Amino acid sequence: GVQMLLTIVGAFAAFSLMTIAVGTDYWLYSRGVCKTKSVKNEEVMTHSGLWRTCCLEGNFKGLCKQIDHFPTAEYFLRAVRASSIFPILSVILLFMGGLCIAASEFYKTRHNIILSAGIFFVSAGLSNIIGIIVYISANAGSYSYGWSFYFGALSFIIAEMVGVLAVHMFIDRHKQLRATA
Amino acid sequence: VATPKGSSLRTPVNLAVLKLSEAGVLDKLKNKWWYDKGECG
């Protein structure tokens, strides 16, 4: 009862946090530009996310551009980093975990719909680590990570905690069946 | 800057160049063409 309530709340939190990270732009406070060619540049602080980059300060404060991820083993990294498959697949897996948790609230007989939720959450956390590493690794080849990056990192923790909690619930269901039979 | 020998412009030109160094007009043009109108940043 109370354990399922924590799981529901934690599931939503991690999903929400991760969806707010993949959607925002405050990932990396870098030092670049925001505009393109014209008939010199303005290197000012630019809070740059995954898809867009607005110049925090400077004459063009708030102009977001489209990060150009393509300026053997390096092409593959760029493609993964450019499509943010991992940061986007964690959000797809966390959402599927919520459906599994919700499905297990209307079909109590099926105990295998709770284990699925746990695996989804746990796998979502693992997919958010490759995203972090891919991000940092690709971004490499002075900065300061922002709140958007920390929501992605914080999502993992919340998701991993929901993952263990769901596994515990699965085991608890089966323990009840092994005591009444 | 160069001038034919015996010219009357040797001294006015020589002083003009010095007058443009203290004022920083020789470094402003160098920055204008080497860096301001540059491409590598």
From Swiss-Prot, chain A:
Keywords: Calcium, Calcium channel, Calcium transport, Glycoprotein, Ion channel, Ion transport, Membrane, Phosphoprotein, Synapse, Synaptosome, Transmembrane, Transmembrane helix, Transport, Voltage-gated channel. One of its GO terms (biological process) is neurotransmitter receptor localization to postsynaptic specialization membrane. One of its GO terms (molecular function) is channel regulator activity. It comes from the Eukaryota. The chain crosses the membrane at residues 4-24, 83-103, 113-133, 151-171. The keyword Metal-binding does not apply. It is found in: Membrane; Synapse, Synaptosome. GO terms for cellular component: AMPA glutamate receptor complex; cell surface; cerebellar mossy fiber; glutamatergic synapse; hippocampal mossy fiber to CA3 synapse; postsynaptic density membrane; Schaffer collateral - CA1 synapse; somatodendritic compartment. It is a multi-pass membrane protein. The keyword Amino-acid biosynthesis does not apply. The L-type calcium channel is composed of five subunits: alpha-1, alpha-2/delta, beta and gamma. Interacts with the PDZ domains of DLG4/PSD-95 and DLG1/SAP97. May interact with GOPC. Acts as an auxiliary subunit for AMPA-selective glutamate receptors (AMPARs). Found in a complex with GRIA1, GRIA2, GRIA3, GRIA4, CNIH2, CNIH3, CACNG3, CACNG4, CACNG5, CACNG7 and CACNG8. Interacts with GRIA1 and GRIA2. Interacts with MPP2. Belongs to the PMP-22/EMP/MP20 family. CACNG subfamily. Regulates the trafficking and gating properties of AMPA-selective glutamate receptors (AMPARs). Promotes their targeting to the cell membrane and synapses and modulates their gating properties by slowing their rates of activation, deactivation and desensitization. Does not show subunit-specific AMPA receptor regulation and regulates all AMPAR subunits. Thought to stabilize the calcium channel in an inactivated (closed) state. This is Voltage-dependent calcium channel gamma-2 subunit. It comes from Rattus norvegicus (Rat). The chain holds residues 7 to 212 of 323 of the full protein.
Curated annotation (Swiss-Prot), chain B:
Palmitoylated. Depalmitoylated upon L-glutamate stimulation. Detected in cerebellum. It is found in: Cell membrane; Postsynaptic cell membrane; Cell projection, Dendrite. The M4 transmembrane segment mediates tetramerization and is required for cell surface expression. Homotetramer or heterotetramer of pore-forming glutamate receptor subunits. Tetramers may be formed by the dimerization of dimers. Interacts with EPB41L1 via its C-terminus. Isoform 3 interacts with PICK1. Found in a complex with GRIA1, GRIA2, GRIA3, CNIH2, CNIH3, CACNG2, CACNG3, CACNG4, CACNG5, CACNG7 and CACNG8. Interacts with CACNG5 and PRKCG. Found in a complex with GRIA1, GRIA2, GRIA3, DLG4, CACNG8 and CNIH2. Belongs to the glutamate-gated ion channel (TC 1.A.10.1) family. GRIA4 subfamily. Ionotropic glutamate receptor that functions as a ligand-gated cation channel, gated by L-glutamate and glutamatergic agonists such as alpha-amino-3-hydroxy-5-methyl-4-isoxazolepropionic acid (AMPA), quisqualic acid, and kainic acid. L-glutamate acts as an excitatory neurotransmitter at many synapses in the central nervous system and plays an important role in fast excitatory synaptic transmission. The postsynaptic actions of L-glutamate are mediated by a variety of receptors that are named according to their selective agonists. This receptor binds AMPA (quisqualate) > L-glutamate > kainate. This is Glutamate receptor 4. The chain holds residues 756 to 795 of 902 of the full protein.
